[PDB]
Amino acid sequence: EVQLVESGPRLVKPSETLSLTCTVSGGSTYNHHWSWIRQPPGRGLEWIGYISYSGKSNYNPSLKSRVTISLEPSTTQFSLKLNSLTAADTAVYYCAREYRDDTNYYYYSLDVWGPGTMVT
Amino acid sequence: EVQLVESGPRLVKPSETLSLTCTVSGGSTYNHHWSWIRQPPGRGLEWIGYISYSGKSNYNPSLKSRVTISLEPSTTQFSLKLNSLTAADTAVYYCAREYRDDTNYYYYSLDVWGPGTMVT
Amino acid sequence: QIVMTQSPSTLSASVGDRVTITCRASQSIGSWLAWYQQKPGKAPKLLIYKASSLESGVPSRFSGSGSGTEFTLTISSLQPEDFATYYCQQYNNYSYTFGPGTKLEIK
Amino acid sequence: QIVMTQSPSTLSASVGDRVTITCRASQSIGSWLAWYQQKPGKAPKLLIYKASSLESGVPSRFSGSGSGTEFTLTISSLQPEDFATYYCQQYNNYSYTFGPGTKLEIK
Amino acid sequence: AHCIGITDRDFIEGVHGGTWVSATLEQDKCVTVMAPDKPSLDISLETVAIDRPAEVRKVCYNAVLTHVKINDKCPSTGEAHLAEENEGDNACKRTYSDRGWGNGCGLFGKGSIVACAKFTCAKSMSLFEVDQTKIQYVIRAQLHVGAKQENWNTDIKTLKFDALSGSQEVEFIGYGKATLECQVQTAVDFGNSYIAEMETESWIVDRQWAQDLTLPWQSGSGGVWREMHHLVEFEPPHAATIRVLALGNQEGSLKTALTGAMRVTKDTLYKLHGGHVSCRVKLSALTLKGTSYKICTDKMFFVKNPTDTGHGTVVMQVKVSKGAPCRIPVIVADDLTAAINKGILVTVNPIASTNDDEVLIEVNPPFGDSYIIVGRGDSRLTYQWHKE
Amino acid sequence: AHCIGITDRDFIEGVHGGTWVSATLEQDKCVTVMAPDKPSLDISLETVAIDRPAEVRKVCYNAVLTHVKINDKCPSTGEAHLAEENEGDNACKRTYSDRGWGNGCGLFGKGSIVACAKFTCAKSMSLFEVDQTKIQYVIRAQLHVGAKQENWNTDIKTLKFDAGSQEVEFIGYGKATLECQVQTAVDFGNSYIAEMETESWIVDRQWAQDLTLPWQSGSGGVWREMHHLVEFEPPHAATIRVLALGNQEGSLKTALTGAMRVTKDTLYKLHGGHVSCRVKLSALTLKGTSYKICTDKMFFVKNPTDTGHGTVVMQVKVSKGAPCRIPVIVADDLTAAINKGILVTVNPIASTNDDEVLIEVNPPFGDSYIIVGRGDSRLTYQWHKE
Known part of the structure; x- marks a missing residue:
């Protein structure tokens, strides 16, 4: 049972940086694209970005200048770092697994999610 | 090269009868449904009816009371018999073969036609 | 007895056009539909059977599609040859019924 | 970045009803579309992937269809579970985009 | 008949x-x-x-795989598990793969890896009981x-x-x-036979042979395919993946195996x-019928001339235009003079009940030359026959 | 590598x-x-x-039949003919059937009967030349x-x-x-690349050409020997049951299992x-044989671990050193500084600071000590090797 948990500073003052970390249990991080998605209270989901074990990564154009997603393979966990914060960045941050099977050609998008964590 | 040719009285008086005969060459009459279709000058096609070697036949509901289609298998030709004529029955009469294969289940509707004879 | 309608009643086009005639049944007739081509003084010749299947040897520019109620006959590139009246006919169940006919002539 | 829209914004219905939500992409995304169900305070759960394929073990009453631009999620017989917010998401090419969401509540 | x-x-x-x-x-x-x-x-x-024969078994000869999932844990801590492991319609394999630094694994050795795939039978063969x-x-x-x-x-x-009628x-x-x-x-040997039908085609086959088929098989009630591994192959794992492929359509080999049944x-x-x-x-x-009928004397006509049947007999169709309810005298003689029947009448005692009636006669003429004679007087019909 | x-x-x-x-x-x-x-x-x-190998042959292993036409003459009246007899894409049989008054012919004997069917290959196998x-x-x-x-x-x-x-x-x-x-x-002159859908093989040319299946070429699309997948059952009266044979994917693949x-x-x-x-x-x-020896403190980023090759790997960080080389030995005692181990990563190096360097050593059998550095700053790791 592949499970993700995101953790880190809950209360963040403006103008600083956002240090979030998603921990992956039940499976390694060699496969798949490990992604971040956020959801402000009372609004819709916003796909932040992803990183892979390969090194290939990609960010949402509205957030690219600030977002940095890194991968720590040894402990099987990856980190989100968002700079130049604002009141707009107040949202529930989920880390999720984008399942990608390049062997049998199956792609289920974001199939496994974390509880989601509320950042202000 | 299956060919059909219709023949018979070109002029038929009212209250008399219409005896047309379609001659089938290039193939036997054991299979398929042998049909009659008529077309008034400058007007549309009207499916009159059919008869089979089995004996099963069917006539257009607007014509059934008068129409009789019979089959002579030995000479490989079949006959149309139309009673109680009127000015509406003045038309070009085609005899045609409705191809039906009940062994391999293929049905091409009316695939082979005759040149047609104008009855007034 | 099933009633077949056709649209349009008449169509004028030029050589090289892509033309489309439509055919409607009063009720469902499955795929049992035939398309016939009639030239003046000649008998109807079978072009399409079972909605989409071409009779040999009808030119590949002719094509048909549709099922249930609606059907369409399509000529991708019109030819001087193709100018005639096209009738549709259901052969789902007796008694069989032809369409009123769609006339195709030169512009 | 590809833009996704959804219709309607909100839908009120009762248990036992048949509902159908629509999702539109700014451009063609093939069949690479996912449907998510989100309940208040909880994470989105994956229902449908590749437009029509159900994730195990989502109830067979859930279904999806469409390809390119037009998409639809269908519940044949509504249940108390199904009352939540439904988001659509394209994953044909980065960056991925979620829809604004279709809210489904009880009458 | x-x-x-x-x-x-x-x-x-x-x-x-x-x-x-x-x-x-x-x-x-x-x-x-x-x-x-x-x-x-x-x-x-x-x-x-x-x-209405009863279904006893189904035997899949073509299967498609969907929803292919993979779990690929690292060495030491970690048995790999997929939810699809506990579902009935999934073919699954549990193995171990060589992993270490390079696959995101702090240790070098065997890591558990499980691959499951949705087994759905595209085409199957029905086995009915006789x-x-x-x-x-x-x-x-x-x-x-x-x-x-x-x-x-x-x-x-x-x-x-x-x-038992x-x-x-x-x-x-x-x-x-x-x-x-x-x-x-x-x-047929009921206590040892099945009706085996593929799509359109069917056979009477050996039960033992059918059950011994190395293909997935089902039952009359629950729809869970058994022995799915027969049509599902799992290639050796590389790093964190497994090649899961469905085997080929077995229609041809089966049908060739069924040619003699x-x-x-x-x-x-x-x-x-x-x-x-x-x-x-x-x-x-x-x-x-009509053994006491009078004899047909009126002019008769061969609607259909005497023709060979291939059964060593001849058939003919005679119209009786005017003659009332009457019986027709048909004989096969060796000459026009002797009225001695050398032929055998298959259509025993021919008859014409109504008028303009067409009646079919079948006779077994003797070997050699003969005359088929129907009727008497100037009205009678004669037809030359040769049968070597 | x-x-x-x-x-x-x-x-x-x-x-x-x-x-x-x-x-x-x-x-x-x-x-x-x-x-x-x-x-x-x-x-x-x-x-x-x-x-880009060149396609040379195709071999159909699944075919579908359409447009089944039949023409049936009575005995002594002619040979039956179909228009489709002359098309390239039709599988045809000409035979004779038992006929007479029972089927509506006026004579008893053999009547000509011809059956043609549209041959279209659903799935085929490509044979490329190597x-x-x-x-x-x-x-x-x-x-x-x-x-x-x-x-x-x-x-x-x-x-x-x-x-x-x-x-x-x-x-x-x-x-x-x-x-x-x-x-x-490969016997290049006696082999094909045989590809079906996703899977391919190196096959023997003789075997490929000797297959009892319809086959084509890289050019014209006229299927030859269509009869291999088309069966005409014996004629009854005025019809013939025309069947396409079964999918040959399985038998082919099973025949190819060892290739x-x-x-x-x-x-x-x-x-x-x-x-x-x-x-x-x-x-x-x-490189860096003349670098000075790292004397500053080092730390195991990744502890010595078994590789399965009889060697061990480790990752060492050099935070407070300059361009320097790392002294790595494997001794049988902490006092004796005599290397019994073999260094695969010959002369480890630290160009920049905070640099992480991977060492691979082949330690001796039994008990041993992995020593990285000298003095009080040195790292020691007890290792056992069967």
Whole structure:
């Protein structure tokens, strides 16, 4: 049972940086694209970005200048770092697994999610 | 090269009868449904009816009371018999073969036609 | 007895056009539909059977599609040859019924 | 970045009803579309992937269809579970985009 | 019935005082029963079949795989598990892969990896059970009266029998009745056979052979495919992935394996391509019509000239234009002078009840040259025949 | 390259004055070439493949039949004819049927009956010709320098060859020269690439041409020997049951179970062959032999772990050192500084600060001590090796 948990500073003052970390249990991080998605209270989901074990990564154009997603393979966990914060960045941050099977050609998008964590 | 040719009285008086005969060459009459279709000058096609070697036949509901289609298998030709004529029955009469294969289940509707004879 | 309608009643086009005639049944007739081509003084010749299947040897520019109620006959590139009246006919169940006919002539 | 829209914004219905939500992409995304169900305070759960394929073990009453631009999620017989917010998401090419969401509540 | 058109035809001649006559009816083959001073009886096997046979097994010969999932844990801490492991419709394999630094694994060694895939059968072969007591068979019976081929379909009395049905009576109007005491011979070993049908095609196969097939198989109730591994192959794992492929369509190999088996065809009822029926035919209650009729003297016409049947007999169709209810004198002589019949009449005592009536005559002429003579006087018809 | 991750690993140690070193590379297998006073060279076979091979044959293994037409004459009235008898894409049979008054012919005997059917191949197998002059192969080469696994793809030099020797220059370490020759199992003049859907094989030409199936060419689309998948049951009266035979995918694949495999890029890769290589080691130089010894504190980023190759790997960070070299030995005692171990990563190095360097050592059997550095700052790790 592949499970993700995101953790880190809950209360963040403006103008600083956002240090979030998603921990992956039940499976390694060699496969798949490990992604971040956020959801402000009372609004819709916003796909932040992803990183892979390969090194290939990609960010949402509205957030690219600030977002940095890194991968720590040894402990099987990856980190989100968002700079130049604002009141707009107040949202529930989920880390999720984008399942990608390049062997049998199956792609289920974001199939496994974390509880989601509320950042202000 | 299956060919059909219709023949018979070109002029038929009212209250008399219409005896047309379609001659089938290039193939036997054991299979398929042998049909009659008529077309008034400058007007549309009207499916009159059919008869089979089995004996099963069917006539257009607007014509059934008068129409009789019979089959002579030995000479490989079949006959149309139309009673109680009127000015509406003045038309070009085609005899045609409705191809039906009940062994391999293929049905091409009316695939082979005759040149047609104008009855007034 | 099933009633077949056709649209349009008449169509004028030029050589090289892509033309489309439509055919409607009063009720469902499955795929049992035939398309016939009639030239003046000649008998109807079978072009399409079972909605989409071409009779040999009808030119590949002719094509048909549709099922249930609606059907369409399509000529991708019109030819001087193709100018005639096209009738549709259901052969789902007796008694069989032809369409009123769609006339195709030169512009 | 590809833009996704959804219709309607909100839908009120009762248990036992048949509902159908629509999702539109700014451009063609093939069949690479996912449907998510989100309940208040909880994470989105994956229902449908590749437009029509159900994730195990989502109830067979859930279904999806469409390809390119037009998409639809269908519940044949509504249940108390199904009352939540439904988001659509394209994953044909980065960056991925979620829809604004279709809210489904009880009458 | 009618046995004239059916090429594989046997003649069975009854003795004068015979009450019963044995006859065996095979497929695509008919029997003509003759007896002195009695009408000829055409008997034939139409179908031997089974109605509503019970499904016992299904055997998939083409499967497609969907929803291929993979879990790829690292060495030491971690058994890999997928939810699809505990579902019925998934073919799964549990293995271990070589992993270490490079695959995101702090240790070098074997890491557990599980691959599951949705097994859904594209095309399967149905295995029905065959019950002797559920077998029905059909027999066509028709007397040799002067009838047109186009009237045969009106005359033929078709009879249906069960596995333990009894003697069945067939009455022909103005000709009495005959009784058929029939028994069906299966050619099948029910306690060791299946009806195996693929799409359109069916066979009678060995049960043992069917169960010994190395293919996934199902049952009549629960829809869980068993022994799925027969059509699902899992390639050796590389790092964090597994190649899961479905094997090829087995239609061809199966059909080639089935070439020698007894055939079956299901149509709008399962027809059997084999078997036969043993029948005892009662002829005593069969009577000849119009033996007391006057003789046809009016001008007659060959609507259809005497022609070879391939059964060693000749057939002809004679119209009686004016003559009233009368009997037709048909003989086959060796000359125009001697009125001595050397030929044998299959259509016993020809008749024309109404006028302009067309009547079919079948005669067995003697070997060599002969004359077919129908009628008397100046009105009689003569036709030259040669039969080497 | 890198041969640490590849479990099937061979070591080839060169002699001191040796200029060339022979090495054989098999699929999914790599070789580590060592030589005294010279950096270790990891070599591996990635792929052996063919580019744009020419299609020569098609062999249909599933066909569908449409447009079943039948023409039936009565005896003594002519040979039956169909219009479709003359089309290229129709499978046809001409026979004679038992006929008479029973079917509506006025004579008894054989009546001509002809049955034609539209032959269209649903699924076919492509047979490409294998030209040895189109064979290319790829070899990974990478030196054993102090780097991390996530930088391996940056360090690895990938090399492409066709049917001469190639030079590989490693920055600050000189260069090696590979004189390689590819040996594959193919009778090019007696083999096809046989591809069905996703799977491909190297098949024997005779077998492919001897298949009892319809076959085509690379050009005109006229199927020959269509009768292999089309059966005409004996005629009854005025009809003939025309059947298409079953899907031959399974029987074909089962007949192909033992043959050499081939795949495609999502370029036909071969699941076999090997490469014989002559490796020049003389032009390879060792970097930073004159660097000072790291005296500042070091830390195990990654502790010494078993590789399965009888060697151990470890990752050491140098935070507060300058360009310096790391003293690594494996002794049988902490007091005695006598190295019994063999260093695969010959002369470890730290160019910049906070630099993480990977050490691979081949320790002796039994109990031993892995020693990294000197003085009080040194790291010691007890190791046991069966």
